[PDB]
Design a protein around this ligand. Sequence first.
Ligand SMILES: Cc1cc2nc3c(=O)[nH]c(=O)nc-3n(C[C@H](O)[C@H](O)[C@H](O)COP(=O)(O)O)c2cc1C
Ligand code: SF4
Ligand code: SF4
Ligand code: SF4
Ligand code: SF4
Ligand code: FES
Ligand code: FES
Ligand SMILES: [Mg+2]
Lengths: 217, 59, 42, 230, 431, 62
Amino acid sequence: GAGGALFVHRDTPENNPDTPFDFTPENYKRIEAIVKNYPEGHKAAAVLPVLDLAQRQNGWLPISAMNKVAEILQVPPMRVYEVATFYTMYNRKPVGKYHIQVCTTTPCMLRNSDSILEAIQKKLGIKVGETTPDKLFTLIEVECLGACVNAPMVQINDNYYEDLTPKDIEEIIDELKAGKIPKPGPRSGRFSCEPAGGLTSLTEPPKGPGFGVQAGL
Amino acid sequence: RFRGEHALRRYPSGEERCIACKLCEAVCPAQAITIEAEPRADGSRRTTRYDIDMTKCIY
Amino acid sequence: DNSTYRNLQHHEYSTYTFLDLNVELSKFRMPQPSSGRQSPRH
Amino acid sequence: SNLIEVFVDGQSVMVEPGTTVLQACEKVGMQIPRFCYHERLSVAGNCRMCLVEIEKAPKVVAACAMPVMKGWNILTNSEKSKKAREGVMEFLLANHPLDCPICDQGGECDLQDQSMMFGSDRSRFLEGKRAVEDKNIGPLVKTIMTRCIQCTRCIRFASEIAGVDDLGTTGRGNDMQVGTYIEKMFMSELSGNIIDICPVGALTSKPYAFTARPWETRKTESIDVMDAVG
Amino acid sequence: KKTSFGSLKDEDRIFTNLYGRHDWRLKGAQSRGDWYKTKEILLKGPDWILGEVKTSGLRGRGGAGFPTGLKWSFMNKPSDGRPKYLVVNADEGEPGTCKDREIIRHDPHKLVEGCLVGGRAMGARAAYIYIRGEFYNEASNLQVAIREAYEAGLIGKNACGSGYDFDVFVVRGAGAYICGEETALIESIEGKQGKPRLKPPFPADVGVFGCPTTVANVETVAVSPTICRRGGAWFASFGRERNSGTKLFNISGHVNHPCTVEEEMSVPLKELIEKHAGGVIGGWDNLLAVIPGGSSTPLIPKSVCETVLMDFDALVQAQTGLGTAAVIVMDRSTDIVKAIARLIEFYKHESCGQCTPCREGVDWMNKVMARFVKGDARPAEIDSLWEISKQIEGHTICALGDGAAWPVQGLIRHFRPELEERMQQFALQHQ
Amino acid sequence: WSSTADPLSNLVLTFSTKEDAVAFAEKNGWSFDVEERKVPKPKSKSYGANFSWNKRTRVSTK
Ligand SMILES: Cc1cc2nc3c(=O)[nH]c(=O)nc-3n(C[C@H](O)[C@H](O)[C@H](O)COP(=O)(O)O)c2cc1C
Ligand code: SF4
Ligand code: SF4
Ligand code: SF4
Ligand code: SF4
Ligand code: FES
Ligand code: FES
Ligand SMILES: [Mg+2]
């Protein structure tokens, strides 16, 4: 389906070049280390990490953040604009403090991932891409998330909640509303995408060092 | 299909259909059409001059 | 043995853990090579 | 010398090492179709219009970017390369707007001429086309990005020839757009040349808008006197 | 000599900490045999390591399937003046694939050791790990493993009592499937938008930062040190000729127990599903289709998957290819057209769009499949769609266009009657 | 409309080579001006120059 996110920027009182944004000194130390990673003369290779750091400091990316990163890295602002508009994890609009991302690709869709999305719809009373009025939750439907084998799954602020059922996602949402943090990982008494009752591999104690080193070594 | 005197038509809204593409001027075997265009007050692509010499036209 | 899960620790990661660890590692690493100039635009 | 011998349609030509397929075809006397390649700009390899077949090679190569090596036979008129051109033009024209009568680049469009020569004559596209919002980069260049074919030629000219880095691509995939991402005017003493390099009517001359058609005009070769460059 | 594959003993596997039931830190890695006699391997030279890899018969696990020994030998050219880098592909974008994430979160020290050994064989100065941006907790786990290695002196200052200096860096992406492609990955590391670049030049000559580079999958570099430690012939014992080794498999979709498991290479698909996955939901007769190697590989029906092997060559014989060994199964109670349309929509969302064929044609194919799902088209269009795929396939810059063309081709080739029946039903009901 | 008075306003003649055109002009008794053919000089194009380690041909985007 059509994305719906605009790739042009119009000045807003909330999002304008005069909007105050700056890095805290700790973020300056982190930026210094990030630039120290890359070879001399190629500081632009730090556009993606530093920009991410800006988001992690602000929660989203105004035009001021893009301009500040470009100024810090001595790169044209348009390059930062292309980087921000290309990669999907960069939020160019404000989002709720809990960003819900549901995977609806074929491996997840096969194991009834639409039911979990509909359960989120009913619990939150907001549509697929909207935001709750209290600015607590933002629902977005995403592509594969690398947890296909343990589907269905959701991502909420760098955390994976997997093997979900409508009841499980209801519990996660209400627990997040209450205030405490839920435990990430698969539900239903499963750890680390192991077979539910098979255990067909990795049953014997692992062998110690140098079990099968060849001769001459 | 009968073809006699020429006419310039317009849309049901009343705004002329000609967009100054100048294809009629280019196809005219007798070179009987003269066209000049420019952007209008609203920026529309319209003709400021559209003459047909009916003594040169071969219909 | 294999019954017990030994990866309960990722439950306690902050939003700056990756960058904090990068900062910590920054002083275990060798100097970067140079192209001789500050940027291709220099 | 160190020249290598290659063949174009079975005709031998001696070319320097590092020469591309397109340049060897130029030397023999053929012009490979192109949309994103400009001899004055860096190679991009985007439009994929210059795909040509090498003999005994199962895959077509991009002539504008592929250096030629000793012993190749370039088959420019093979059925494979012709089908490649037809498919590429079909993809180019799938989302292009029906704006030819109102386009300032009617009789001097590379898209039109290369569709007439190297493309098919009908469409099998039964979907709805896309439409993008026009930008505003100043009073000199009129911008209609719905006609843009994303050859990224203006971007390269601005970045390299003009030394001005405000043009770029924002977005991913089919809804990728070319522009500044902000309300900014592309101002430079060489800003008008993006009108010339653009093969389509996406960038046109605003003072020239709607004034004339290429076939009407008479061309007189003369000299500039606005400065001492001549 | 061996004709039957698919019984891999527990003690003979590589990733013994696949399920995370043991400690994933340096102590656990030492207990499981990691970082053992690494100094001797480093001192034995790059030529010996490349010879062991070549005699091992290892092939790339990213999906291309190219023999890794040849790539690393191409990287083994003498010095030029520029530094040399090794890049490990941890993007893990292709749907149905979950193995790289597991081996990086629950057993990272094998990855770190493989990075060091590969860099030694490759003459690489440093290693860059491009991990998926969404993978945050396991990126942090890999960073902790790297810190533990640095404190122990396993990488960095001489990395051993070997005298060879090597650094390992971790780079996080930001939501882009195309960034898994080697050239697009290099572009993203270089701070630009992730658009694949043409070849030539190949990365072994002009790569990251313009320096010689080779991109490798996590599984390849992870298994390289164990291959060197146990010998090439031991790895070459498993699987068939030109298909040697053990492979990580993800089984997903309509199975009783979806899981990841390490198994001998040329294991039959049916016994792989019936043994580790718990069998298709509702029994084997309920099976309708299977995608053996992730979204890029074309699907195959029950008739051919009854007696098919699971490796590169035998799957190419089935007109599919192994790909990334990501098995996605579908029983007879699902809309296969809907699933393939979802895959094409994913490919439409995840194409960078720099070259005209992939961009325009993939959007066109997405629209045509969306129209097929409800049966709104006519049968004369099906062949047209086939033609469109052949225009995308082989004419794009990178292999994303190929990976978007293949699923449509497989769906058409194996279930044209389903599409025709759906079209007839729509025409009848709408009149 | 645009009126003219000379007959040779729209007259353009085509010739295979420069010498043929000059011979025609001299035979018909017309004073002529000839300027030599301009050919675009060959250029060294290389895609790999875009991704330069230390030179300035390193492109900012693509
Ligand atoms: C669109 C696309 C996405 C890819 N994503 C990955 C990936 O996530 N991980 C991976 O190892 N290879 C991926 N590849 C294949 C890479 O080309 C491959 O990793 C690279 O050639 C090195 O793989 P190797 O270790 O098998 O040699 C992708 C290829 C394409 C075309
Ligand atoms: S210029 Fe002629 S052909 Fe073009 S729209 Fe006007 S009348 Fe029609
Ligand atoms: S750019 Fe060319 S093809 Fe497109 S509308 Fe204008 S004249 Fe027609
Ligand atoms: S505006 Fe013109 S020159 Fe620029 S990318 Fe689009 S088609 Fe190419
Ligand atoms: S095939 Fe698609 S993803 Fe690959 S370079 Fe072309 S447009 Fe980009
Ligand atoms: S299909 Fe859902 S994580 Fe990939
Ligand atoms: S002219 Fe070669 S790909 Fe565009
Ligand atoms: Mg133009």
